Design a protein around this nucleic acid. Structure first.
Ligand SMILES: *C(=O)c1cnc2ccccc2n1
Ligand SMILES: *C(=O)c1cnc2ccccc2n1
Ligand SMILES: *C(=O)c1cnc2ccccc2n1
Ligand SMILES: *C(=O)c1cnc2ccccc2n1
Ligand SMILES: [Mg+2]
Ligand SMILES: [Mg+2]
Lengths: 8, 8
DNA sequence: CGTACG
DNA sequence: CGTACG
């Protein structure tokens, strides 16, 4: 759920 | 994440 | 690095 | 009730 590189 | 009634 | 429902 | 990444 975080999007630091993927945002899912 | 489960969709038993919303599916999110 | 943790968000997302009826 | 539990899922979703590079
Ligand atoms: C977001 O909160 C989140 C949490 N755990 C994960 C595991 C696998 C891929 C994506 C994820 N996203
Ligand atoms: C994004 O592409 C990405 C990849 N690996 C990580 C590891 C831990 C924290 C955040 C990350 N973000
Ligand atoms: C799915 O796995 C999941 C987990 N917890 C939640 C909390 C709030 C809304 C949606 C949710 N979805
Ligand atoms: C779906 O609409 C819905 C509503 N509340 C719940 C509570 C517990 C398990 C599954 C649920 N599904
Ligand atoms: Mg985890
Ligand atoms: Mg929970």
């Amino acid at each position: 759920x975080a999007x630091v590189x993927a945002x899912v």
